[PDB]
Design a binder for this molecule. Structure first.
Ligand SMILES: Nc1nc2c(ncn2[C@@H]2O[C@H](COP(=O)(O)CP(=O)(O)OP(=O)(O)O)[C@@H](O)[C@H]2O)c(=O)[nH]1
Lengths: 620, 245, 710
RNA sequence: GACUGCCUGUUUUUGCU
RNA sequence: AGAGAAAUCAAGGCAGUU
């Protein structure tokens, strides 16, 4: 593609000076610029002054070196009108301006005295005076070669256009790419539909007023069993003597008796040996133990292969599509009692957060509200369960090497202000090699129970624990828990923020209307309780809010997410109707159908749906 | 100078080991300055806990000031990291070891790396706060300059102002014109200790922080000055407003 | 739920924060995406006709339909050509300053857009590796492909890249000739830069050359191909969605159109998609000049947004805009290539539909055996399937919002509208309820004209204006904060303790500034974040870091080291190091030691860093934390080994060396972009000569230095 | 088959706008 | 078993040997 007269060096140097390909007659412009640079080179061919060469080429050179040379020559040039070469024998800078007229002198700039050629080889008389003859004959030869190449390709219009003005930006779609493009549309590249622009008048439908709030569907079926990772409100601790985790576990292991009160087929009673071995190992000092023969059942080792082999052994003969059924379940009775026991007053504060610094009066106000909120919601069973969940998740996820092949023991031990250790249970992390966010790490959670049900804990296996003339119930469930859930439950203490926001808003609004902060406001708040309106004190309300948010968080699933997302519209509609406002809907509007499609088996979703269906549906 | 010799040696080594990458275009530096196979911004929150606990969890370029074993604990590996040419792994306690047993820089470099932050701290700790008054204040949003700047400069001339602070010998006369003469000497006098070729990747960032004005929507009751806007998170709200003097 | 609905003190709208469960696990998608992709591609073919007929709707190329064919009582896929033409003209006649700024962008900023801006993206489908790769790697390989099949150097501008893409498809056949490790299971080690007691090794890998042959049709298919994936950690839906990524051969074309759409949208008063254009809706809510007027408020969402839209209507709107500004024909041939490639789109299916035989299941393609998507078998190309109607992903949210806005512009609609992709809000100001009903129905029908399809069960209109919703922001006489949205972002990040602390304080301060948090909520969030920060960085209880600090007598002086917190609610904008220095917690010696430029553990970074909460819209966050010794990064993931394409590591390290020789000779590439014309070798050589010559040394010393350069 | 070691825990077709 | 919800995890690859 390179012209014959153009040298390889100048061609390669020109390759990237300007973007030829997106310019009109880009190749011709490249050839013209190569002509100019070659002409400049021929002007400065071995001709010297003093000790340095007479002309310095300022075209197609790095800008920083050009600035260095200019500084040495005590001159400075703008970038967008920089000269093409500098003569140090006459202290003038020159520019090549191949033109056609050879009669329009018209000094282009007063900074550099311009040099113009007629493109035939002759030079404008000033340039003829200011240059030596050998250069003139060299340029004559170079230009006669240039124009024989031009006439050999019929580019005279292109070259005169290029020497006339500057570059023009363009984009070009080829014929072949256009046909590939137009394979799936009825229009061409630039659509020109032959229709008259107008907006048609289409007859629609009427808009209906929502006279009554929608009634959610209370689903029917077997009650939902408790499916959270831990036991929630039915969780207790053993008050161990003060010390470290190892001492407490040694005390528990030595001073205990294990007998099975209730065995579930989901978690066999033979996996208690795994827990005993883990307790003994952790008491001896090493928190990680090897595999025993009862681990293959407690952790599902080689479960995938045996299930695959059984499925291969027993198979049908049709290869139908896969249909998955999610079993329908009703609101279990344990949700309300869970909400009650989670509000039970405790003896000590279970929310211990290090205070932040105080530097401004604003800072103390912020830390007073938080201190009072922690005082309100810390001495409560829900705070205890949040704490135990945080230690369990953190000690399981931090000991989650996430690549390990032996069983790790993670006791759930907290300290009371008196220093006595409190044994809530022990999680047992098993052989885990989780990589994807959907991968499940095997777990075997032993937990101290408060009361067995067989309707709320069908999969757990309850054991009797005898420690120093005291009776405790020890649950033992085989679970699989994922890295994402272990991550989000290690930060479970964030659930204290939504209840705190409500209390903060109430207190700060009362302060704003009273023009002064109190910190000891106990307002009555009206709620629809048992179907009727009753006034409650915002200290029990934040506690109910806290327990409900904790239950929602530990039961969060796609059903809960969809229910909550589609239910805010209905809650906003209720708020609108409470203010004696009218709610209108489009034609096929059934806003309760997007809420009712998420009520399948989640017990907290059913509890919220029932709470909604205990509220007034018309606001007269 | 031996620095020029080191630069020549590094250029020769880069030419020899990477013939193809040296045949690229200089304008491609804007795209291979980020060429990496690592995916570290992809859900980083959910991996932190077991990543800092993994053996050899930290990335630390080889050096002689870090012993292989210090008080029985292995601090660093003898294997270059994967996908790294001047970077290897180490132990998580290497920052802690360096915090006490590491080398020291000059007292002037510290006042340069910590200049903008020091001005922010002194601005915070040199205000007589008023008394908190509570009321149903109405905070309204409005684009206001986030933090005070050393001098008012058009956001279009910041690159051309910093070029005269760091590399004035690698610029044209047009960039010389479109620069705020008056903000260049202050930046030079406060950044000279870190204008070296080693802290130049950190001096430009902080020097831009002193000089760049980024309009940001911030709540307010009364019109913010540029100095009362970096502190708007606690001077105003929908329930309280403290009046600074 | 009766507890979440107050009747006194605070309004139920203030308790919308309690209707979020964001502290629990986020829904994660399991298994094959092929069913959710085939059920995403078939929906546009089921809503084209009023009565479902997929077989006849599979022959439609341009989704133009007649006014009497639009399904007014259901989702309607397609548009009306004359209505699109008239609405694109009415949108041009008004908002004319926006069109002037668009023209300014076309004639000034568009010519000066570089193709290196395609490296600031994320995972991109590679037409050479047939996998998802980081944007820099895909861009580098695409440019190397284009620079060897076209046998020319691609210009720095995006227009050069687009021209190269448009010119490479003219060729009948193309090649790649890449590199790979023949035996990735053989890791060999050599001694680099160390033979003194403490050795330093590296991993050497072989690099053979392999070539891939693309015909014109295979390369065209790879340009059309859209790699699909599950959208993990999506909150607020019962069912999981699929998201896709366009190839790097179409991303420049898409970016041009999206940048122009952004230039339009940041100047139209009816658009909320731009982040800074969200506070205008606060003014629309505060606009209470109503007087005895029936002023309603409609807040809703659009059903099947990326399924009822046709690329041809959007192309036509862009064509009308450009042709009415006055533009060269290559401008109208550049803004239309994206929409004509996304009309021939070839969405990538999954690994096969789940077929069960008793208990065991097998993953099998769409063609094998019947299923519920047997109509689409005729559109299957290899493991990919074509889909003319519908968008199938939200790659164009900007221009989709533009289409909705041009639909808004009519004469009888005299209300205020704010549009943001799928979610929107409209304010009516009429004289009677019946006029408001006509305006609402006209709005619905006009959105259905171009295929916007308001969701019947998600749009709720309140006859007295004042209560509404827009992008999880609830309104009742004002917009109240929603703290629940920020909770998924209060967990410390995974970069380093300094950046983690800085970003945590920045997030909490931003939440406070938006009204989503207040005094108590902000302080409690700070305390919770501090506890998580200390736990996550080995600073609580008995751990290896605390131990090593104990025996070695290293006192804790930083928050990540276990020291008492120094940041407060007032001091959230301040840095930990400077705050500790001012109060006397870091006297002089540790400060001169942790801030040492010769720290072997610190790594240089950028004051702007990626910040995504959970598969939501990516944002940018300021990181002004100083480069102390605690500003490090985690070890590199080593899964790339044992893979044929591990040779990308050698290329990465070579590029790191080339970046290291740069940034030392060129200190102007830290302040602005690189614009020197030429190769890297030539520029580096010239800058070496310039620095040595400008230096003050003996001339003999100088030429001896130059002699070594080779 | 499994059976001797090696490697991987985000990079395996899987976090886009 | 279990986790779980519209389909996956319950380790996976590679080299040699067999
Ligand atoms: N490219 C992306 N687009 C997104 C993302 N999140 C939302 N969106 C866009 O927002 C819109 C979501 O609306 P959908 O199309 O799912 C319709 P609707 O919200 O009514 O849901 P359905 O009722 O279930 O159809 C759509 O345009 C999406 O492309 C995202 O992460 N990426």
């Amino acid at each position: 593609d390179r012209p014959d007269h153009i040298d390889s060096r100048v061609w390669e140097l020109s390759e990237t000076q300007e973007d030829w390909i997106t310019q009109v007659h880009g190749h011709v412009r490249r050839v013209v610029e190569c002509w100019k640079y070659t002409i400049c080179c021929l002007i400065s061919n071995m001709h010297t002054h003093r000790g340095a060469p007479q002309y310095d080429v300022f075209k197609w050179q790095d800008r920083s070196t050009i600035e260095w040379i200019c500084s040495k020559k005590k001159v400075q040039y703008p970038e967008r009108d920089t000269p093409d070469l500098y003569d140090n024998e006459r202290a003038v800078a020159y520019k090549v301006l191949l033109v056609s007229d050879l009669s329009d002198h018209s000094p282009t700039s007063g900074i550099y005295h311009d040099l113009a050629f007629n493109l035939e080889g002759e030079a404008e008389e000033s340039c003829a005076l200011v240059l030596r003859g050998s250069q003139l004959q060299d340029i004559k030869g170079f230009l006669c070669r240039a124009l024989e190449w031009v006439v050999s390709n019929n580019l005279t219009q292109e070259v005169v256009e290029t020497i006339s003005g500057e570059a023009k930006l363009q984009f070009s779609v080829g014929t072949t790419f256009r046909t590939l493009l137009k394979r799936d549309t009825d229009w061409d590249v630039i659509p020109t539909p032959r229709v008259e622009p107008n907006v048609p008048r289409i007859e629609g439908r009427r808009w209906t007023q929502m006279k009554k709030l929608p009634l959610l569907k209370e689903k029917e079926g077997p009650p939902s069993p408790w499916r959270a990772l831990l036991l929630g409100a039915d969780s207790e601790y053993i008050v161990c003597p003060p010390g470290t985790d190892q001492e407490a576990i040694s005390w528990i292991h030595s001073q205990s008796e294990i007998e099975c009160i209730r065995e579930s087929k989901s978690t066999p009673a033979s996996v208690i040996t795994c827990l005993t071995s883990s307790l003994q190992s952790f008491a001896e000092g090493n928190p990680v133990r090897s595999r025993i023969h009862e681990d293959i059942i407690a952790f599902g080792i080689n479960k995938k292969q045996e299930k695959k082999q059984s499925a291969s052994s027993s198979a049908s003969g049709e290869w139908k599509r896969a249909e998955y059924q999610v079993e329908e379940m009703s609101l279990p009775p344990w949700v309300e009692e869970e909400m009650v026991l989670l509000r039970s007053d405790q003896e000590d504060n279970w929310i211990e957060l290090e205070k932040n610094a105080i530097y401004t009066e604003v800072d103390g106000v912020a830390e007073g509200l938080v201190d009072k909120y922690i005082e309100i919601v810390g001495r409560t069973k829900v705070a205890s369960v949040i704490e135990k969940w945080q230690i369990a998740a953190t000690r399981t996820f931090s000991q989650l090497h996430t690549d390990r092949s032996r069983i790790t023991a993670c006791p759930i031990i907290t300290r009371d202000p008196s220093g006595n250790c409190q044994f809530w249970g022990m999680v047992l992390l098993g052989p885990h090699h989780v990589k994807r966010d959907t991968d499940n790490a095997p777990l075997l959670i032993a937990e101290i129970m408060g009361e067995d049900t067989e309707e709320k804990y069908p999969k757990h296996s309850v054991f009797s624990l005898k420690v120093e003339e005291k009776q405790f119930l020890l649950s033992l469930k085989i679970t699989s828990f994922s890295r994402n859930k272990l991550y989000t439950f290690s930060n479970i203490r964030r659930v204290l923020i939504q209840p705190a926001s409500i209390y903060s808003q109430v207190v700060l609004s009362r302060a704003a209307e009273n023009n002064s902060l109190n910190l000891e406001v106990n307002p009555e708040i009206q709620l629809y309780l048992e179907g009727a309106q009753r006034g409650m004190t915002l200290y029990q309300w934040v506690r109910m809010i806290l327990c409900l948010e904790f239950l929602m968080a530990i039961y969060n699933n796609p059903q809960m997410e969809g229910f909550l997302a589609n239910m805010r519209r209905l809650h906003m509609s209720r708020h609108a109707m409470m203010e004696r406002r009218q709610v209108f809907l489009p034609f096929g509007s059934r806003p309760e159908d997007k809420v009712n499609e998420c009520i399948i088996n989640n017990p907290i979703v059913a509890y919220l749906a029932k709470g909604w269906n205990s509220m007034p549906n018309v606001y007269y | 100078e031996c620095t020029l010799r080191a630069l020549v040696e590094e250029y020769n080594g880069a030419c020899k080991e990477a013939p193809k990458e040296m045949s690229k275009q200089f304008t491609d530096y804007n795209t291979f300055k980020r060429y990496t196979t690592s995916k570290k911004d992809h859900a980083p929150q959910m991996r932190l806990v077991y990543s800092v606990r993994k053996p050899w969890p930290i990335s630390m370029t080889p050096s002689k000031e870090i012993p292989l074993v210090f008080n029985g604990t292995k601090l660093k590996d003898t294997i270059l990291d994967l996908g790294e040419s001047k970077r290897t792994r180490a132990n998580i306690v290497v920052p802690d070891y360096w915090s006490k047993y590491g080398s020291q820089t000059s007292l002037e470099v510290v006042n340069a790396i910590l200049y903008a932050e020091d001005l922010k701290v002194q601005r915070f700790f040199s205000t007589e706060w008023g008394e908190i008054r509570y009321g149903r204040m109405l905070p309204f949003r409005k684009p206001v300059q986030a933090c005070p700047t050393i001098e008012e400069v058009n956001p279009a001339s910041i690159p051309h102002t910093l070029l005269q602070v760091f590399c004035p010998q690698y610029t044209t006369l047009d960039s010389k014109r479109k620069a705020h003469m008056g903000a260049v000497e202050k930046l030079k006098r406060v950044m000279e200790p870190i204008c070296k070729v080693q802290t130049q990747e950190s001096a430009v960032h902080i020097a831009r922080s002193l000089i760049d004005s980024n309009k940001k929507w911030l709540p307010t009751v009364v019109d913010h000055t540029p100095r009362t806007a970096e502190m708007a998170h606690f001077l105003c709200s929908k329930y309280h407003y403290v009046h600074t003097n | 739920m009766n507890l979440f609905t107050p009747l006194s003190e605070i309004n139920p709208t203030t308790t919308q924060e309690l209707l979020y469960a964001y502290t629990g696990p986020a829904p994660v998608a399991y298994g094959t995406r092929t069913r959710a992709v085939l059920e995403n591609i078939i929906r546009p073919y089921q809503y084209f006709y009023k009565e479902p007929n997929v077989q006849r709707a599979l022959d439609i190329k341009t989704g133009c339909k007649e006014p009497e064919d639009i399904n007014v009582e259901g989702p309607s896929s397609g548009f009306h050509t004359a209505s699109v033409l008239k609405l694109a003209d009415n949108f041009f006649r008004k908002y004319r300053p926006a069109m002037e700024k668009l023209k300014y962008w076309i004639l000034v900023k568009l010519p000066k857009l570089k193709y290196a801006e395609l490296s600031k993206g994320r995972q991109t489908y590679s037409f050479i590796h047939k996998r998802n790769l980081p944007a820099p790697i895909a861009l580098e390989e695409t440019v190397e492909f284009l620079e060897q099949n076209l046998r020319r150097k691609i210009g720095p501008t995006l227009l050069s890249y687009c021209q190269a893409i448009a010119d490479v498809m003219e060729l009948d056949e193309t090649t790649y000739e890449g590199a790979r490790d023949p035996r990735p299971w053989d890791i060999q080690l050599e001694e680099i830069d160390s033979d003194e007691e403490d050795p330093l090794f590296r991993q050497v890998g072989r690099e053979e050359t392999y070539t891939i042959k693309f015909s014109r049709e295979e390369l065209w298919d790879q340009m059309r191909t859209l790699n699909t994936m599950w959208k993990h950690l999506e909150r607020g839906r019962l069912n999981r969605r699929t998201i896709a990524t366009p190839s790097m051969l179409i991303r420049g074309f898409v970016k041009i159109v999206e940048d122009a759409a952004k230039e339009i949208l940041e100047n139209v008063p009816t658009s909320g998609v731009p982040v800074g254009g969200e506070e205008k809706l606060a003014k629309l809510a505060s606009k209470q000049t109503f007087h005895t007027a029936v002023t309603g408020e409609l807040s809703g969402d659009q059903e099947k947004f990326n399924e009822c839209l046709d690329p041809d209507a959007m192309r036509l709107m862009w064509t009308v805009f450009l042709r009415k500004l006055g533009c060269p024909d290559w401008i109208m041939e550049l803004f239309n290539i994206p929409f004509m490639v996304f009309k021939s789109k070839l969405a990538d299916m999954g690994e096969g539909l789940v077929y069960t035989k008793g208990k065991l299941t097998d993953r099998k393609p769409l063609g094998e055996m019947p299923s519920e998507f047997d109509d689409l078998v005729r559109n299957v190309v290899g493991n990919s399937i074509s889909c003319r109607l519908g968008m199938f992903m939200g790659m164009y949210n900007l221009t989709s919002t533009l289409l909705a806005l041009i639909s808004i512009e009519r004469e009888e609609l005299t209300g205020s509208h704010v549009e943001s992709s799928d979610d929107f809000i409209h304010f009516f100001n009429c004289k009677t309820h019946e006029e408001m009903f006509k305006q609402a129905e006209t709005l619905r029908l006009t959105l259905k004209l171009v295929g916007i399809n308001m969701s019947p069960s998600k749009c709720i209109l309140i006859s007295p204006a004042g209560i509404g919703e827009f992008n999880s922001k609830f309104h009742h006489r004002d917009f109240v904060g929603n703290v629940a949205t920020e909770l998924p972002a209060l967990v410390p990040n995974g970069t380093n303790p300094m950046t983690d602390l800085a970003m945590g304080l920045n997030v909490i301060k931003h939440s406070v500034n938006t009204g989503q948090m207040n005094l108590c909520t902000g302080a409690l969030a700070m305390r919770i974040f501090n506890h998580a920060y200390k736990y996550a960085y080995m600073a609580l209880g008995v751990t290896r870091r605390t131990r090593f600090m104990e025996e070695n007598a290293i006192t804790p002086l930083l928050t990540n080291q276990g020291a008492s917190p120094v940041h407060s609610f007032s001091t959230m904008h301040l840095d930990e190091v400077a705050l500790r220095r001012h109060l006397g917690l870091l006297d002089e010696e540790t400060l001169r030691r942790i801030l040492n430029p010769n720290n072997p553990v610190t790594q240089k970074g950028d004051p702007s860093m990626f910040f995504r909460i959970e598969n939501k819209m990516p944002q940018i966050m300021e990181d002004y934390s100083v480069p102390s010794c605690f500003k490090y990064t985690l070890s590199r993931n080593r899964t790339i080994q044992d893979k044929p394409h591990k040779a990308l590591l050698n290329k990465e390290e070579r590029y790191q060396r080339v970046t290291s020789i740069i940034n030392k000779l060129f200190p102007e590439v830290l302040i602005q972009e690189a614009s020197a014309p030429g190769t890297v070798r030539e520029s580096l050589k010239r800058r070496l000569e310039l620095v040595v010559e400008r230096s003050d040394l003996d001339e003999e010393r100088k030429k001896r230095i130059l002699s070594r350069i080779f």
